[PDB]
Amino acid sequence: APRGERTRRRALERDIAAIWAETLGRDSVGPHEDFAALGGNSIHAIKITNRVEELVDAELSIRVLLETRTVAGMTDHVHATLT
């Protein structure tokens, strides 16, 4: 039962990490790296969030990125909304 839900969530996490990496101009971003430690600013926060919203086809507060601050944290806070 939760093998499936772990697979579901890791797939989202992969995609969100790629959005962060592209936006922040890095080859990749780790699941637990802090947004600000990566040089993330308000412009990046908006772009990442806009793209994650297009990805899951749902509107999300910018607080979702800015209060979780990691790709894994954001994933979980989004994966919840969808569940």
CSV table of N, CA, C and O in Angstrom, one decimal:
chain,number,residue,atom,x,y,z
A,1,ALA,N,0.8,-1.3,0.0
A,1,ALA,CA,0.0,0.0,0.0
A,1,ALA,C,0.8,1.3,0.0
A,1,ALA,O,0.7,2.1,-0.9
A,2,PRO,N,1.7,1.6,1.0
A,2,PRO,CA,2.6,2.8,1.0
A,2,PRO,C,3.9,2.7,0.2
A,2,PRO,O,4.5,3.8,0.0
A,3,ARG,N,4.3,1.5,-0.4
A,3,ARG,CA,5.2,1.5,-1.5
A,3,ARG,C,4.8,2.5,-2.7
A,3,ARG,O,5.5,3.4,-3.1
A,4,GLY,N,3.5,2.3,-3.1
A,4,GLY,CA,2.9,3.2,-4.1
A,4,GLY,C,2.9,4.6,-3.8
A,4,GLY,O,3.3,5.5,-4.6
A,5,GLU,N,2.6,5.0,-2.5
A,5,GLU,CA,2.5,6.4,-2.2
A,5,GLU,C,4.0,7.0,-2.1
A,5,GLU,O,4.2,8.2,-2.4
A,6,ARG,N,4.9,6.2,-1.7
A,6,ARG,CA,6.3,6.6,-1.7
A,6,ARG,C,6.8,6.9,-3.2
A,6,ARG,O,7.4,7.8,-3.5
A,7,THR,N,6.4,6.0,-4.1
A,7,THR,CA,6.7,6.2,-5.5
A,7,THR,C,6.0,7.4,-6.1
A,7,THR,O,6.7,8.3,-6.7
A,8,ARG,N,4.8,7.6,-5.8
A,8,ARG,CA,4.1,8.8,-6.1
A,8,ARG,C,4.8,10.1,-5.7
A,8,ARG,O,5.0,11.1,-6.5
A,9,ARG,N,5.1,10.1,-4.4
A,9,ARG,CA,5.8,11.3,-3.9
A,9,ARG,C,7.2,11.6,-4.4
A,9,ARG,O,7.5,12.7,-4.7
A,10,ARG,N,8.0,10.5,-4.6
A,10,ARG,CA,9.4,10.7,-5.2
A,10,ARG,C,9.3,11.2,-6.6
A,10,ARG,O,10.1,12.0,-7.0
A,11,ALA,N,8.3,10.8,-7.3
A,11,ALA,CA,8.1,11.3,-8.7
A,11,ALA,C,7.9,12.8,-8.7
A,11,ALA,O,8.5,13.5,-9.5
A,12,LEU,N,7.0,13.3,-7.8
A,12,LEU,CA,6.8,14.7,-7.7
A,12,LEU,C,8.1,15.4,-7.2
A,12,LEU,O,8.4,16.5,-7.8
A,13,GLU,N,8.8,14.9,-6.3
A,13,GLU,CA,10.0,15.5,-5.7
A,13,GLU,C,11.1,15.6,-6.8
A,13,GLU,O,11.7,16.7,-6.8
A,14,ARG,N,11.2,14.6,-7.7
A,14,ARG,CA,12.1,14.7,-8.8
A,14,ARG,C,11.8,15.9,-9.7
A,14,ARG,O,12.7,16.7,-10.0
A,15,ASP,N,10.6,16.1,-10.0
A,15,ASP,CA,10.2,17.2,-10.9
A,15,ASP,C,10.3,18.5,-10.2
A,15,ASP,O,10.7,19.5,-10.9
A,16,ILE,N,10.0,18.6,-9.0
A,16,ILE,CA,10.2,19.9,-8.3
A,16,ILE,C,11.7,20.2,-8.2
A,16,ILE,O,12.1,21.4,-8.5
A,17,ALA,N,12.5,19.2,-7.9
A,17,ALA,CA,13.9,19.5,-7.8
A,17,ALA,C,14.4,20.1,-9.2
A,17,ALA,O,15.2,21.0,-9.2
A,18,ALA,N,14.0,19.5,-10.3
A,18,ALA,CA,14.4,20.0,-11.6
A,18,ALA,C,14.0,21.4,-11.8
A,18,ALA,O,14.7,22.2,-12.4
A,19,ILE,N,12.8,21.8,-11.4
A,19,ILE,CA,12.3,23.2,-11.5
A,19,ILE,C,13.2,24.1,-10.7
A,19,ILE,O,13.6,25.2,-11.2
A,20,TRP,N,13.5,23.8,-9.4
A,20,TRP,CA,14.5,24.5,-8.6
A,20,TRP,C,15.8,24.7,-9.3
A,20,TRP,O,16.5,25.7,-9.4
A,21,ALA,N,16.4,23.6,-9.9
A,21,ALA,CA,17.7,23.6,-10.4
A,21,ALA,C,17.7,24.5,-11.6
A,21,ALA,O,18.6,25.3,-11.8
A,22,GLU,N,16.7,24.4,-12.5
A,22,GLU,CA,16.6,25.2,-13.7
A,22,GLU,C,16.5,26.6,-13.3
A,22,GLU,O,17.1,27.5,-13.9
A,23,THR,N,15.6,26.9,-12.4
A,23,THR,CA,15.4,28.3,-12.0
A,23,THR,C,16.6,28.9,-11.4
A,23,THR,O,16.9,30.1,-11.6
A,24,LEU,N,17.4,28.2,-10.6
A,24,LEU,CA,18.5,28.7,-9.9
A,24,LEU,C,19.8,28.5,-10.7
A,24,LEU,O,20.9,28.8,-10.2
A,25,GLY,N,19.6,28.0,-11.9
A,25,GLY,CA,20.7,27.7,-12.8
A,25,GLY,C,21.8,26.8,-12.3
A,25,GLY,O,23.0,27.0,-12.5
A,26,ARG,N,21.4,25.6,-11.7
A,26,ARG,CA,22.3,24.6,-11.3
A,26,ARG,C,22.1,23.3,-12.0
A,26,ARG,O,21.0,23.2,-12.5
A,27,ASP,N,23.1,22.4,-12.1
A,27,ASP,CA,22.9,21.2,-12.8
A,27,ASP,C,21.8,20.4,-12.0
A,27,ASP,O,21.0,19.6,-12.6
A,28,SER,N,21.8,20.5,-10.7
A,28,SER,CA,20.8,19.9,-9.9
A,28,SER,C,20.9,20.5,-8.5
A,28,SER,O,21.8,21.2,-8.1
A,29,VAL,N,19.8,20.1,-7.8
A,29,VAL,CA,19.6,20.6,-6.4
A,29,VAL,C,19.2,19.4,-5.6
A,29,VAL,O,18.3,18.5,-6.0
A,30,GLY,N,19.8,19.2,-4.4
A,30,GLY,CA,19.5,18.1,-3.5
A,30,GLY,C,18.1,18.4,-2.8
A,30,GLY,O,17.7,19.5,-2.6
A,31,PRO,N,17.5,17.3,-2.3
A,31,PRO,CA,16.2,17.4,-1.7
A,31,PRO,C,16.1,18.2,-0.4
A,31,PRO,O,15.0,18.7,-0.1
A,32,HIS,N,17.2,18.3,0.3
A,32,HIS,CA,17.2,19.0,1.6
A,32,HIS,C,18.1,20.2,1.7
A,32,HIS,O,18.3,20.7,2.8
A,33,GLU,N,18.4,20.8,0.5
A,33,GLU,CA,19.2,22.0,0.5
A,33,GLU,C,18.3,23.2,0.7
A,33,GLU,O,17.3,23.3,0.1
A,34,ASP,N,18.8,24.1,1.6
A,34,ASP,CA,17.9,25.3,1.9
A,34,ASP,C,17.9,26.3,0.7
A,34,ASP,O,18.9,26.7,0.2
A,35,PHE,N,16.7,26.8,0.4
A,35,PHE,CA,16.4,27.8,-0.7
A,35,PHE,C,17.4,28.9,-0.7
A,35,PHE,O,17.9,29.3,-1.8
A,36,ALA,N,17.5,29.6,0.4
A,36,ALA,CA,18.4,30.8,0.5
A,36,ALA,C,19.8,30.4,0.5
A,36,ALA,O,20.6,31.2,-0.1
A,37,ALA,N,20.2,29.3,1.0
A,37,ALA,CA,21.6,28.8,0.9
A,37,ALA,C,21.9,28.6,-0.6
A,37,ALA,O,23.1,28.8,-1.0
A,38,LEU,N,21.0,28.2,-1.4
A,38,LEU,CA,21.2,28.1,-2.9
A,38,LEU,C,21.2,29.5,-3.6
A,38,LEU,O,21.3,29.5,-4.8
A,39,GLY,N,21.1,30.6,-2.9
A,39,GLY,CA,21.0,31.9,-3.5
A,39,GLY,C,19.6,32.3,-3.9
A,39,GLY,O,19.4,33.2,-4.8
A,40,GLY,N,18.6,31.6,-3.4
A,40,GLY,CA,17.2,31.9,-3.9
A,40,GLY,C,16.8,33.2,-3.4
A,40,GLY,O,17.0,33.6,-2.2
A,41,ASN,N,16.2,34.0,-4.3
A,41,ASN,CA,15.6,35.3,-4.0
A,41,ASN,C,14.1,35.3,-4.3
A,41,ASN,O,13.6,34.3,-4.8
A,42,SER,N,13.4,36.5,-4.1
A,42,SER,CA,12.0,36.6,-4.3
A,42,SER,C,11.6,36.3,-5.8
A,42,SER,O,10.6,35.6,-6.0
A,43,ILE,N,12.4,36.8,-6.8
A,43,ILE,CA,12.2,36.5,-8.2
A,43,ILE,C,12.2,35.0,-8.4
A,43,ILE,O,11.3,34.4,-9.1
A,44,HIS,N,13.2,34.3,-7.8
A,44,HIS,CA,13.2,32.8,-8.0
A,44,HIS,C,12.1,32.1,-7.4
A,44,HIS,O,11.5,31.1,-7.9
A,45,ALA,N,11.7,32.5,-6.2
A,45,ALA,CA,10.6,32.0,-5.4
A,45,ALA,C,9.3,32.0,-6.3
A,45,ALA,O,8.5,31.0,-6.3
A,46,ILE,N,9.0,33.2,-6.9
A,46,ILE,CA,7.8,33.3,-7.7
A,46,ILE,C,7.9,32.4,-8.9
A,46,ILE,O,6.9,31.7,-9.2
A,47,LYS,N,9.1,32.3,-9.6
A,47,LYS,CA,9.2,31.5,-10.8
A,47,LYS,C,9.0,30.0,-10.5
A,47,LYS,O,8.4,29.3,-11.2
A,48,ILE,N,9.7,29.6,-9.4
A,48,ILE,CA,9.6,28.2,-9.0
A,48,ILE,C,8.1,27.8,-8.7
A,48,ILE,O,7.6,26.8,-9.1
A,49,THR,N,7.5,28.7,-7.9
A,49,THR,CA,6.1,28.4,-7.5
A,49,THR,C,5.2,28.4,-8.7
A,49,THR,O,4.3,27.6,-8.8
A,50,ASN,N,5.3,29.4,-9.6
A,50,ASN,CA,4.5,29.5,-10.8
A,50,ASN,C,4.6,28.1,-11.5
A,50,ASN,O,3.6,27.6,-12.0
A,51,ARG,N,5.8,27.6,-11.6
A,51,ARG,CA,6.0,26.4,-12.4
A,51,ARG,C,5.5,25.1,-11.7
A,51,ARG,O,5.1,24.2,-12.3
A,52,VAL,N,5.7,25.1,-10.4
A,52,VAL,CA,5.1,24.0,-9.6
A,52,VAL,C,3.6,24.0,-9.7
A,52,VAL,O,3.0,22.9,-9.9
A,53,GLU,N,3.0,25.2,-9.7
A,53,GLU,CA,1.5,25.2,-9.8
A,53,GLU,C,1.1,24.7,-11.2
A,53,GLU,O,0.1,24.0,-11.3
A,54,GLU,N,1.8,25.1,-12.3
A,54,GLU,CA,1.5,24.6,-13.6
A,54,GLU,C,1.7,23.1,-13.6
A,54,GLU,O,0.9,22.3,-14.0
A,55,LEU,N,2.8,22.6,-13.0
A,55,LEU,CA,3.0,21.2,-12.9
A,55,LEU,C,1.9,20.3,-12.3
A,55,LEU,O,1.6,19.3,-12.8
A,56,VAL,N,1.3,20.7,-11.2
A,56,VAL,CA,0.3,20.0,-10.4
A,56,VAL,C,-1.1,20.5,-10.7
A,56,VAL,O,-2.1,20.0,-10.2
A,57,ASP,N,-1.2,21.5,-11.5
A,57,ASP,CA,-2.4,22.2,-12.0
A,57,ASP,C,-3.3,22.6,-10.8
A,57,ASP,O,-4.5,22.3,-10.7
A,58,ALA,N,-2.7,23.3,-9.9
A,58,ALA,CA,-3.3,23.8,-8.7
A,58,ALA,C,-2.6,25.1,-8.2
A,58,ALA,O,-1.4,25.1,-8.3
A,59,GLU,N,-3.3,26.0,-7.7
A,59,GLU,CA,-2.7,27.3,-7.1
A,59,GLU,C,-2.1,27.0,-5.7
A,59,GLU,O,-2.6,26.2,-5.0
A,60,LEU,N,-1.0,27.6,-5.5
A,60,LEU,CA,-0.2,27.4,-4.3
A,60,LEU,C,0.3,28.8,-3.8
A,60,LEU,O,0.8,29.6,-4.6
A,61,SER,N,0.2,29.0,-2.5
A,61,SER,CA,0.8,30.2,-1.8
A,61,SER,C,2.3,30.1,-2.0
A,61,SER,O,2.9,29.0,-2.0
A,62,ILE,N,2.9,31.2,-2.2
A,62,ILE,CA,4.3,31.4,-2.1
A,62,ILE,C,4.9,30.9,-0.8
A,62,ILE,O,6.1,30.5,-0.7
A,63,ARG,N,4.1,31.0,0.3
A,63,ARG,CA,4.4,30.4,1.6
A,63,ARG,C,4.8,29.0,1.6
A,63,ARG,O,5.5,28.5,2.4
A,64,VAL,N,4.3,28.2,0.6
A,64,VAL,CA,4.6,26.8,0.5
A,64,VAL,C,6.1,26.6,0.3
A,64,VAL,O,6.8,25.9,1.1
A,65,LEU,N,6.7,27.3,-0.6
A,65,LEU,CA,8.2,27.3,-0.7
A,65,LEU,C,8.9,28.0,0.4
A,65,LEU,O,9.9,27.5,1.0
A,66,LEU,N,8.4,29.2,0.8
A,66,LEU,CA,9.2,30.0,1.7
A,66,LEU,C,9.1,29.5,3.2
A,66,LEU,O,9.9,29.9,3.9
A,67,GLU,N,8.1,28.7,3.5
A,67,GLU,CA,8.0,28.2,4.8
A,67,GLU,C,8.5,26.7,5.0
A,67,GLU,O,8.8,26.3,6.1
A,68,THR,N,8.7,26.0,3.9
A,68,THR,CA,9.3,24.7,3.9
A,68,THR,C,10.8,24.8,3.6
A,68,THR,O,11.6,24.1,4.2
A,69,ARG,N,11.1,25.6,2.6
A,69,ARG,CA,12.5,25.9,2.2
A,69,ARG,C,13.4,24.8,1.6
A,69,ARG,O,14.5,25.1,1.3
A,70,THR,N,12.9,23.6,1.5
A,70,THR,CA,13.6,22.6,0.8
A,70,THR,C,12.7,22.0,-0.3
A,70,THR,O,11.5,22.1,-0.2
A,71,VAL,N,13.3,21.3,-1.3
A,71,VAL,CA,12.6,20.6,-2.3
A,71,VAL,C,11.7,19.5,-1.6
A,71,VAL,O,10.5,19.4,-2.0
A,72,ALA,N,12.3,18.7,-0.7
A,72,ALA,CA,11.5,17.6,-0.1
A,72,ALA,C,10.4,18.1,0.8
A,72,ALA,O,9.3,17.5,0.8
A,73,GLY,N,10.6,19.2,1.5
A,73,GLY,CA,9.6,19.9,2.3
A,73,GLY,C,8.5,20.4,1.5
A,73,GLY,O,7.3,20.1,1.8
A,74,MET,N,8.8,21.1,0.4
A,74,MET,CA,7.8,21.6,-0.5
A,74,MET,C,7.0,20.5,-1.1
A,74,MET,O,5.8,20.6,-1.2
A,75,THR,N,7.7,19.5,-1.5
A,75,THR,CA,7.0,18.3,-2.1
A,75,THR,C,6.0,17.7,-1.2
A,75,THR,O,4.8,17.4,-1.6
A,76,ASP,N,6.4,17.5,0.1
A,76,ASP,CA,5.5,17.0,1.1
A,76,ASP,C,4.3,17.9,1.3
A,76,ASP,O,3.2,17.4,1.4
A,77,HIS,N,4.5,19.2,1.3
A,77,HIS,CA,3.5,20.2,1.6
A,77,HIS,C,2.5,20.4,0.4
A,77,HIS,O,1.3,20.8,0.5
A,78,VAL,N,3.0,20.1,-0.8
A,78,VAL,CA,2.2,20.0,-2.0
A,78,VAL,C,1.5,18.6,-2.0
A,78,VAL,O,0.4,18.6,-2.3
A,79,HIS,N,2.2,17.5,-1.9
A,79,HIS,CA,1.7,16.1,-2.0
A,79,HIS,C,0.6,15.8,-1.1
A,79,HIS,O,-0.2,14.9,-1.4
A,80,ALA,N,0.5,16.6,0.0
A,80,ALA,CA,-0.5,16.6,1.1
A,80,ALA,C,-1.8,17.3,0.5
A,80,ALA,O,-2.9,16.7,0.6
A,81,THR,N,-1.6,18.5,0.0
A,81,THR,CA,-2.7,19.2,-0.7
A,81,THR,C,-3.5,18.3,-1.7
A,81,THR,O,-4.7,18.1,-1.6
A,82,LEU,N,-2.7,17.7,-2.6
A,82,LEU,CA,-3.3,16.7,-3.5
A,82,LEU,C,-3.8,15.3,-2.8
A,82,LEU,O,-4.2,14.4,-3.5
A,83,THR,N,-3.8,15.2,-1.5
A,83,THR,CA,-4.2,14.0,-0.7
A,83,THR,C,-5.0,14.3,0.5
A,83,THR,O,-5.7,15.3,0.6
